């Protein structure tokens, strides 16, 4: 199964304040109108993952990111529980039935939840946005940028990932975007410079 990503999956490329300006940047972004698979198998991570879900029952518990996903290698486990999120890295049909070096605990995260997962420069970078939508079978149109949620300096190899329990999965590509910042420094629009002439 497959749907249309439209103009979703754009996130703030850095942490610098800008306003009333068109800024040109090159980074790993979800290409506009890219084919986004609509979904529980283990999936490739490739160069980064666009993830979104529309569960009204708080089904998505979290995610597993790693390679072999077994006792041979360090892997990242992100699990959401009541009023908390727990993130750990250890030598770890999961769903509670799912050498530790990373311990992190912070705040938890019709209701469309959008996430971007990157694994670059030793950082597992998570971007996130939460908005209401009026559709169930597809992703909404219009534009909304994802602010960074957490920067995790866990220096591990990720090639595959799995979702802990509908959801959508896309992949990021090296693309150039022209981003439009409004008077409050919010990215309100964008152009995918390689979409068409």
């Amino acid at each position: 199964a497959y749907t249309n990503s439209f103009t979703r999956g754009v996130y703030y490329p850095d942490k610098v304040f800008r306003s009333s300006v068109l800024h040109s940047t090159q980074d790993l972004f979800l290409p506009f109108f890219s084919n986004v698979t609509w979904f529980n198998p283990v999936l490739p991570f490739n160069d980064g993952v666009y993830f979104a879900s529309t569960e009204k029952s708080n089904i998505i518990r979290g995610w597993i990111f790693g390679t072999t996903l077994d006792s041979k290698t360090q892997s990242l486990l992100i699990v959401n529980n009541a009023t908390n999120v727990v993130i750990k890295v250890c030598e770890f049909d999961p769903f509670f039935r799912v050498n530790c070096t990373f311990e992190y605990v912070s705040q938890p995260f019709k209701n469309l939840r959008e996430f971007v997962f990157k694994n670059i420069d030793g950082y597992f970078k998570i971007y996130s946005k939460h908005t209401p939508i009026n559709l169930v079978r597809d992703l909404p149109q219009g534009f909304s940028a994802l602010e960074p949620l957490v920067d995790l300096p866990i220096g591990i190899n990720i090639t595959r990932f799995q979702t802990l329990l509908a959801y959508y999965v896309g992949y990021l590509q090296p693309r150039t975007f022209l981003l439009k910042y409004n008077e409050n420094g919010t990215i309100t629009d964008a152009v995918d410079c390689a979409l068409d002439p």
Binding site: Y12, K15, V16, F17, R18, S19, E147, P148, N184, G185
Partner: protein, 49 residues
């Protein structure tokens, strides 16, 4: 010197709506025109003397 960032100028209160993660803004010459004070988390505008 703000958290390692140096320069010369007049500091005033900023009215820029920085997001919770942003520490400084940049101009078209890639100069810094605003910073987040590392102790008070106050946003300050930088206007050259």
């Amino acid at each position: 010197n703000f958290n390692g960032l140096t320069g010369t100028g007049v500091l005033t209160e900023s009215n820029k709506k920085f997001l919770p993660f942003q520490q400084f803004g940049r101009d078209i010459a890639d100069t810094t025109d605003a910073v987040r004070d590392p102790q008070t988390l106050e946003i300050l505008d930088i206007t050259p003397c």
